[PDB]
């Protein structure tokens, strides 16, 4: 008999647009008379929660609840609570929340790789790397864009973060996008827009051109005699 | 020249389906290198429309298949659901696509 | 006695983070007692901003209230009305602002342009320009970063919105900067951040160095005998 | 009650080159039969100043005033005077103009940029921007002629001057140019003609084309 409450993450503030905060209960039958609500630090009144989760087979239920916030007032470190009172504990539970204040805040830089030149060989397609390295803390998003508009969330494949051996606690994470090879040697630009929450307007933008590994000179020196 | 053989000439109406099967002297690179089958456009090139390693490209996705029987000695393209978009001039061929190793066939679609 | 509801612009909701509305009252008479305040649609109390204004230097009586708001409130759809109460009003003012919804949107074309071959050859100092087109509406914002850690604002200068010649209405701009010819012979990244709000994040950015372009040079060198 | 005073600068000069100033009569009630006077520093009379324009059906007041001078009249100091009298204000009002001496003349560098390689990889329209830098006092006329033939004003687009950032009491201006790509690929001519005063000649010319700034690739150096 519990309650998983799930703070609202930069990859979903950031995708979505819409911060806001759910309350999950874990191990309560699938009765009625539920008690589900969202508090400030003062208690005030909060979104219409609503969309309640389905009866489980296994007699468990968790009514879950979704409640908006104003942007700032998550990151100042609000608290708030999911209060819950069922029919099996008639006695409440506070499952608190907060914004974690703390750990260094220090921002990616990222370093966009162009396909090797042995698989650009095979004429099959090509794998563009966005190496997001060097962030702390973790919740980077990385999402990738061409001339423009963005593409589907189907062609490429980001890493969750890993942490980084060398250097201190500082993650990196990795996204890469295969593209056709035929669409790569037309041009397309293919940039890797990068979402974190240490950067200074929050975005970095880095792109790649066919153009970008090409050599400065070739540098030919022909010898034909007959000696 | 180069040893590979298919069919020089293949003819088939929309909708039906095509096997195109190309020779290989059966050698120990032979058998497990890479085979393709590339789209010869105008402009340039192959365009490798189904590789056997699993590339499948956007166009043929759903509709060709490439097997490869290393001990008969020949790889074979199965693709269904032809359109007249499907006339035109390719190669079966082996390794990478620019280095010869191939043998092109005309494939020609009929009303 | 004139009272403007000054709407946020964008380009300091986004250069300030923190979204301020201001009620600004002019010539009013000299006198005191003066009570200004925000309010919403719902007619909701913001609270009371600090750093009122000092009388006029033309021998009358001015005020500025400054609301800081949540953005989706007033995008949302939620019109804003100040009141200003003072001596020689039989009755206080409200005045009221909206967020003109209702203007197509468009989004900008940065394309950041390096500096002329004639210029880098008088050993002075070169103009990297940003040519935001392409956009619609106005308030656009243009700074410029050199490996994410911003210029000073003296060093390049923005120009205003003026209206596209041949497309409908769309606007550009251009964004300066100048710097001395032995740093862009260095290397230095020079990106060029353009703020608005048609982007998808509200960010794009650019970046030149002195090798973008300058293409593949063959050197052959035949000694056939 | 204001009467301002609309002077002739260097881009109605010289677009025009038969300098006309103007005197605007504003705030008012809507009196006919106005009576208003262009005259010298030695009280002589000049051109009349007809065209009269239409008032203000939000009852503000509307005259112009006009007289054409020739140029070094207006240049060596002679100061020009428009003269108000009315029925609101019977008075002899004076609104004084002139050319105001005493500030510098730097001479305006001018680069003409050539469309960037993002721009032209789309294949839609290409923007040539001339780049005015560097000179002092304001009031330049940036115009456009594609071989010796003026392009049409709803083309380019002028900026206006903003002074330079690391530049003391210097200015700098834009003026960019839609050219359809089609016509850059064949790349015709282009030039940017800059009219300032501190020029020698008061005209300056520059030009880019499809191949300017294009360094050579294929160096090739047989030996024998
Ligand atoms: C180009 O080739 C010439 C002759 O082979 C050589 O002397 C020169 O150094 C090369 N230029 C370079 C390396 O920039
Ligand atoms: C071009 O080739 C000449 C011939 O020897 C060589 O001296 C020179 O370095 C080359 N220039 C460039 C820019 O590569």
């Known amino acids: ?227 | 020249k180069s040893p590979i053989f298919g069919p020089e000439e293949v003819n088939s109406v929309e909708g039906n389906s095509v096997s195109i099967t190309c020779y290989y002297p059966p050698t120990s690179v032979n058998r497990h290198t890479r085979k393709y089958w590339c789209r010869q456009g105008a402009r340039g090139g192959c365009i490798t429309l189904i590789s056997s390693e699993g590339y499948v490209s956007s166009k043929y996705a759903g509709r060709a298949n490439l097997t490869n029987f290393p001990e008969n000695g020949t790889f074979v393209v199965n693709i269904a659901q032809l359109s007249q978009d499907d006339s035109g001039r390719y190669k079966c061929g082996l390794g990478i696509n620019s280095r010869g190793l191939s043998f092109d066939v005309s494939l020609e679609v009929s009303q």
Request: aromatic share 8%; with cysteine; hydrophobic share 35%.
């Open chain 1, 1 to 227: 008999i519990r309650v998983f409450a799930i703070p609202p993450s930069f990859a979903s503030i950031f995708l979505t647009k819409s911060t806001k905060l759910t309350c999950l209960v874990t191990d309560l039958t699938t009765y009625d008379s539920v008690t589900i609500s969202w508090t400030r630090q003062n208690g005030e009144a909060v979104k219409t929660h609503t969309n309640i989760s389905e009866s489980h087979p296994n007699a468990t239920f968790s009514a879950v609840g979704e409640a908006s916030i104003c942007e700032d007032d998550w990151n100042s470190g609000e608290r708030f609570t999911c209060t819950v009172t069922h029919t099996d504990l008639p006695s409440p539970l506070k499952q608190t929340i907060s914004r974690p204040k703390g750990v260094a805040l220090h921002r990616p830089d990222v370093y966009l790789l162009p396909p090797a030149r042995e698989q650009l060989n095979l004429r099959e397609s090509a794998t563009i790397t966005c190496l997001v390295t060097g962030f702390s803390p973790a919740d980077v998003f990385v999402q990738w864009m061409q001339r423009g508009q963005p593409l589907s969330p189907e062609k490429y494949v980001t890493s969750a973060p890993m942490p980084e051996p060398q250097a201190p606690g500082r993650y990196f994470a990795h996204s890469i996008l295969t593209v056709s090879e035929e669409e790569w040697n037309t041009g397309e630009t293919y940039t890797c827009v990068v979402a974190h929450e240490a950067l200074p307007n929050r975005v970095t933008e880095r792109t790649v051109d066919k153009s970008t590994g090409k050599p400065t000179l070739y540098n030919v020196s022909l010898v034909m005699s007959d000696t």
